[PDB]
Amino acid sequence: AREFSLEKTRNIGIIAHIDAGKTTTTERILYYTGRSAATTAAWEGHRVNIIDTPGHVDLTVEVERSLRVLDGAVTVLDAQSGVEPQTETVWRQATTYGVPRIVFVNKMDKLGANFEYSVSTLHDRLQANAAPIQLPIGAEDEFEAIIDLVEMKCFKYTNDLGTEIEEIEIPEDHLDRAEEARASLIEAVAETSDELMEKYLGDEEISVSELKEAIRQATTNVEFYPVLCGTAFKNKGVQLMLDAVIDYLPSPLDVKPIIGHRASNPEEEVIAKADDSAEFAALAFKVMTDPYVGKLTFFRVYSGTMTSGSYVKNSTKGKRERVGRLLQMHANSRQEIDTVYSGDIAAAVGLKDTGTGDTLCGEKNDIILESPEPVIHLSVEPKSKADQDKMTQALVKLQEEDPTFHAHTDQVIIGGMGELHLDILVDRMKKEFNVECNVGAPMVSYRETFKSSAQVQGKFSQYGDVHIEFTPNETGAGFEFENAIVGGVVPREYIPSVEAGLKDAMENGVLAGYPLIDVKAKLYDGSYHDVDSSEMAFKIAASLALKEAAKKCDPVILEPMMKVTIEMPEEYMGDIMGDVTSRRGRVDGMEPRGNAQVVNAYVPLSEMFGYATSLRSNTQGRGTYTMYFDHYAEVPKSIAEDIIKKNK
């Protein structure tokens, strides 16, 4: 029987930069809530789950995931420099996923500390509706009290230990400032609420509570972001902000159910809401390994209820998993339980076949809450044979933790989604798994394809034969083999053996030696013997076909194209281009947001090396970009001729 009720639960995570005072803020939050990937705690008869967000925002896959894991967030800002480039890249994401937010402006105690300023940024840069529900008294050294607007009280801080908080009444000389502040607080909520609009102008006095009811309505619908203040290190306003999480930030019931499809048709939205009556469904957001307990698979349960020792479906991988004991990491402790209801988070011990992104649901049902390709790759050189063991070991494990990377042993070669991605991966090896290894330069991974069609035949004279029709496929369509054979001059016995020989012979590539893609092959005819003909020769044939095809099909080299989104001051807006159009980029569409323009562009990854270093140098620290894969494109003849000569 659950200690806490959905209504009493808060799933949160902390969106902050490092110099915003992130780590220092998390601990205070863990401490005040005490007595990691995810931590269970409590504040005031409320279950509080603090979800660890990724260490860098360039990892989109994670941040997206951790956002769906959580319900609402606490954004931490520096009291001086206001918001910063990445925090907003993440903020907009938060909104795409409809994550309620409250804002805690930290590090008030320092220099250049400007509260009424930092607040501006959310307005100016993020175009966000946010108004202080509190105001400071003093700044820098002078920082002393905090005015709570909604209840109209004040609190004095006599120590840096966060004890003996004097709860006092608002001093005169700040009385006015307090007054227009609460007044300026009460509408920003009212732009949203209706009857409150009358009540404002109509002059009716607004209650403390009835006001609270109103805000928490704005924030849980994310039309308003409450804003707070303090210094985490000196223990000021941390508690008030904790209360704030209780008052405003959503329970699992106050947000909209997570979308997902079923196991066969993945076009149905299947609803997952928090119901203990309904069938259990959950998502695994983290996997690590303890020296003692073994593999830990962390998870959140959106719908249904779960118990220790029963069986569950791992829906993503298509198998059956037997729940071991369930654990809960607390601040300082670990505690075991036999049951997981909805809206809750716990780790599971000894689930053999599970990995990050995997959806666990009940036995009967079929549901999945989540759904990859290398554009860039590295060479890795282990020393002697001593290290080489440990690496190849790691590679097996790492897959389970991050499926988003590829394994190639042909030296060993790992492709990934980017230089940053690949590094953390190498990071994890060099350090955590202790391998000493030479590491190459990032290299674009090119492809190949056919610009035209043809019909050809390989025949291996030990005898094998095929007639295949090779045609350029739709860009992105991948590879689809069609078996058109009828009479059986080629018997089924060797038929899939052809498909293999093709795949394998294409992977090698016909031009510079890069994998062959976007190509249709159809097998319309052949000739077989009954003694000599072997599954081998029927490979050598398919391969042979490919070689002849390569001669008639006008093969071409493909390079990756990225979707580059810049944002900048329009004084430089000409520059970024003469830059882009020097990069073989082309600019498609643009839209303004607030006082800056968002430039959308398409650029070859090959031309994108050292871009951030030319973004700042031109715009003087003002510009910011994002990038991700879009499509493969045909390399220009002059460039392509070189890649050939190289690999030759």
From Swiss-Prot:
Family annotation (InterPro entries): EFG_II, EFG_III, EFG_III/V, EFG_IV, EFG_V, EFG_V-like, EFTu-like_2, G_TR_CS
Listed Gene3D superfamilies: 3.30.230.10, 3.30.70.240, Elongation Factor G (Translational Gtpase), domain 3 (3.30.70.870), P-loop containing nucleotide triphosphate hydrolases (3.40.50.300), Translation factors (2.40.30.10)
One GO molecular-function entry: GTPase activity
Keyword set, alphabetical order: Cytoplasm, Elongation factor, GTP-binding, Nucleotide-binding, Protein biosynthesis
Domain tr-type G: 7-253
Top-level taxon: Bacteria
Binding-site positions, GTP: 16-23, 52-56, 106-109
A Gene Ontology cellular-component term: cytoplasm
The protein's role, per its UniProt record: Catalyzes the GTP-dependent ribosomal translocation step during translation elongation. During this step, the ribosome changes from the pre-translocational (PRE) to the post-translocational (POST) state as the newly formed A-site-bound peptidyl-tRNA and P-site-bound deacylated tRNA move to the P and E sites, respectively. Catalyzes the coordinated movement of the two tRNA molecules, the mRNA and conformational changes in the ribosome.
Record-linked PANTHER family: RIBOSOME-RELEASING FACTOR 2, MITOCHONDRIAL, TRANSLATION ELONGATION FACTOR G-RELATED
Assembly, per entry: Has vitronectin-binding activity.
Protein family according to the UniProt entry: Belongs to the TRAFAC class translation factor GTPase superfamily. Classic translation factor GTPase family. EF-G/EF-2 subfamily.
Protein name listed in UniProt: Elongation factor G
Protein source organism: Staphylococcus aureus
Gene name as annotated: fusA
